[PDB]
A paper describes a structure:
α-TTPS crystallised exclusively when starting from monodisperse solutions of monomeric α-TTP. α-TTPS can exist in different oxidation states; we obtained crystals in both the fully reduced and the fully oxidised states. X-ray diffraction patterns indicated that both crystals belong to the space group I432, with essentially identical unit-cell parameters a = 168.18 Å (reduced) and a = 168.26 Å (oxidised). The crystal structures were solved by molecular replacement method using the atomic model of monomeric α-TTP (PDB code 1OIP39) and refined at 2.40 Å resolution (reduced form; Rwork:Rfree 18.2%:21.5%) and at 2.42 Å resolution (oxidized form; Rwork:Rfree 19.1%:21.2%) respectively. In both cases, the asymmetric unit consists of a single α-TTP molecule (residues 48–278) with one α-Tol ligand bound to it. α-TTPS is formed by 24 protomers, for a molecular mass of 0.76 MDa, assembled into a spheroidal shell reminiscent of a viral capsid. Inspection of the density map of the α-TTPS model revealed well defined density for α-Tol indicating that the protomers in the particle are bound to the ligand. The X-ray structural model of α-TTPS, for both redox states, has an external diameter of 16.8 nm consistent in size with measurements on α-TTPS particles from soluble preparations. The structure is further characterised by an apparently hollow cavity of 8.1 nm diameter. The trimeric interface is characterised by hydrophobic packing and further stabilised by salt bridges. At the very centre, the three W67 residues interact with each other in T-shape by van der Waals stacking.
Residue numbers in the entry:
A (entry chain A), B (entry chain A), C (entry chain A), D (entry chain A): 48 to 275
Write the structure that this text describes.
């Protein structure tokens, strides 16, 4: 069967030395952040999901990557903390990493930063920013093939300035900032598969969020299994 | 007669040490890429030529450089591979290098990247990208005086990011990206000589492609001679 | 045209550094042995040829190598010296090296040492032995793919002991000693192409010698051209 | 055919390392002095030739060297510059170097310095003097076997003092100064072949100059070929 080791091998192109280091950092990072990784049961973040914060596209991008969508406007920082929000991505990642094609072709994430407030950045402490850079680089068995930021306000760049120093040059090359006129540039990266709200043709974000919410709730037994 | 050595001397301004190194890399590169350079007979790429992928201007630029035109939209990656396409440039280069004035004044190439798809970049592997940088720098007796990219889509820069690390600073200075509004900037570099499709006045790309296709087919005996 | 340089490139697999060194040794060796290489006109060794000392097979071996045959019994050391005999091989080599397929696939030589006397070895001085090793290794643009010694007497090994210290390990691997029962082992290396005297089926050594003698005499104008 | 390389090999006794260095300096020197070597067409110096400045003996010296004669009195420094005069020697050298026997036996030059004025030395700048020493030593594929100065005035030694520091010891050994009573000493070096004006028996300098002038004008097509 697809062993737990196999996802780490594929993430590092069957370089046993590199895959081993990634495995070490995976356990290390999970140990230094139990407030995110100790309990992966969707119980603590179901409110976030039903608020419409997160969803995953059905179809893959032209290179076979899984496409993830985050909407920061649907995150209420008064209700959920940065750790809660982080846990959502962690939960999704632990699920999609089971897909062999995702293991081979990595993922791409889209962040709709419309509605980013000063109530969001306060949650993003230096410790949090470094943990963000960790999972983006060499602490989780997922190839980050691209990060796409749209509708990012001027005040956000201060937040990104906290993450960038801990980023490898490879990942920095893969982070895109589109601004408010994102639609044309975003459609080139993701043809046919985007939802209606982002220039897409068929499905809406509400449907996509609901579907992924169901899948997470459905996978609640597996998410408990990998909890320590 | 214009010896085979003479083209290497002129390419390095009669610096015998440098011209010798270029000769060494010329044979080395040809040995490490037989899937491109072993057989230069136009047989394997005649379909590409008649598709309208490549053509050479009759008139030289204001500095005497030969001007080459490539249209990526006329490359069907399902039919022809990157090696096939590479072979086209190799064939053209082996022909125009016979011109003494081309030896002295180098070449300039225009790439119409309109229609660049994710089906094109998949062909461009790290090994291919490094071979591209090789012939652009110090592995073929042709001075690359300028590379002009027009209509380049957003997704192309990821491909260029694979080539750039292997490029010398001199060549990087000579690579131009014009975007969609290229016509004004392109006409300044190439007055009077451009085809109709790119702001020109007289000839069309279809004529230019056909003429160069005829010349290549006509030179099929010479191209077989230099095959190993 | 097939330049004089090209034979040196092919001899060293288009390694310009190595091919250059071979060219240097080619001129050096020719300069330190004018009593062999100054005059390559068949005048001085026509008697050797008509005595039946040397011949070249029409057909190539299974790998495309030219096959050369020497019969030491037809060398009268009282009439011709070691330098005269050496000149024969030099003349043949300068002729067969013009064949592109010989340049690519190298040569193989068969020495019938039947009749090797103490009047032959006296001619083989330490200086001569070292010159033999020179052309076998890195002083002539011919790949020596194999040397086959048959009917070698016990007293010959003393002579070979003079050559061996100056031989590279590569060439030593390619020197074969078959003894008196050579026919079976020799036929495995050279199927279908051997003459009647050595297990062959069709042609005789006398015919083969005469044919190569004619060709050398016919090429007398070219052999004068390369004389210094 | 006698390749362009072959003249450099013979000039350095088939020492490939040394012949290669001479080739490098040949292109270097030609690049640092285009005001002498860019255009070798006899157009710019035909007046010098018809003035009777230069001629070449028909017969070779006892060692087979080509013998060149220069008469400084027939150089009008008001009309022709040092570069023009230098070009004459360059033109002659590029012609006589085609002779295989000249390649093997080198050249000898005779300078009649009778009439050397202070209007001649002003043309001989430090830069010019060093260029003179360059072609005399290791920058042109011609063995300088001897330089003979006759009728040299006292004021000339200041000019020679500018050249001597850049001369190798070998060439310095081969430079002879005869003075006004040169005839006896000059006849020992050049028996039977000298013109009437220098103790000769048959031909006059006017005939010799005219003959070489015709040959240069006749070779005007070749001299254009080697121009860059
Ligand atoms: C394995 C994996 C994880 C675990 C992951 C992400 C990706 C691509 C992964 O492959 C992306 C998002 C992230 C880092 C969660 C981020 C948590 C914070 C609270 C998000 C809100 C504010 C961010 C400042 C917005 C920008 C984020 C991008 C710069 C990644 O969690
Ligand atoms: C001697 C010589 C060769 C041999 C040559 C070129 C030039 C200017 C030369 O002087 C330019 C084109 C190239 C490198 C062939 C490229 C092959 C690939 C398949 C082209 C399609 C995709 C490219 C990623 C498009 C961008 C190319 C530019 C950045 C050069 O082949
Ligand atoms: C380029 C080239 C030359 C020039 C050449 C040979 C080969 C294979 C070449 O590729 C083989 C023969 C040789 C060395 C001539 C040998 C001269 C002596 C006189 C031969 C008689 C006695 C030899 C002791 C017999 C054994 C020779 C083998 C050990 C090669 O000349
Ligand atoms: C290949 C070659 C060249 C190119 C050459 C010469 C020789 C022997 C060559 O082999 C001799 C003459 C020279 C150097 C041209 C000299 C130019 C000047 C203007 C001559 C007039 C004044 C000289 C100060 C007179 C003395 C010259 C000797 C000391 C050589 O050009
Ligand atoms: Cl972008
Ligand atoms: Cl530009
Ligand atoms: Cl054997
Ligand atoms: Cl003297």
């Amino acid at each position: 069967t697809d062993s737990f080791l196999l996802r780490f091998l594929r993430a590092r192109d069957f370089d046993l030395d590199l895959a081993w280091r990634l495995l070490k950092n995976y356990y290390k990072w999970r140990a230094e952040c139990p407030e995110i990784s100790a309990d992966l049961h969707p119980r603590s973040i179901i409110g976030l999901l039903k608020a419409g914060y997160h969803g995953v596209l059905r179809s893959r991008d032209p290179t076979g990557s899984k496409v993830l969508i985050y909407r920061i406007a649907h995150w209420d920082p008064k209700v959920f903390t940065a750790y809660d929000v982080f846990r959502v991505s962690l939960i999704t990642s632990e699920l999609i990493v089971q897909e062999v094609e995702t293991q081979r072709n990595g993922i791409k994430a889209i962040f709709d930063l419309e509605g980013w407030q000063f109530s969001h950045a306060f949650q993003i402490t230096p410790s949090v920013a470094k943990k963000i850079a960790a999972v983006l680089t060499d602490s989780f068995p997922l190839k980050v093939r691209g990060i796409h930021l749209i509708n990012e306000p001027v005040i956000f760049h201060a937040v990104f300035s906290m993450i960038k120093p801990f980023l490898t040059e490879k990942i920095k090359e893969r982070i895109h900032m589109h601004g408010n006129n994102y639609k044309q540039s975003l459609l080139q990266h993701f043809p046919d598969i985007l939802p209606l709200e982002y220039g897409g043709e068929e499905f809406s974000m509400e449907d996509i969020c609901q579907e992924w919410t169901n899948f997470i709730m459905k996978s609640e037994d597996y998410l408990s299994s990998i909890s320590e």
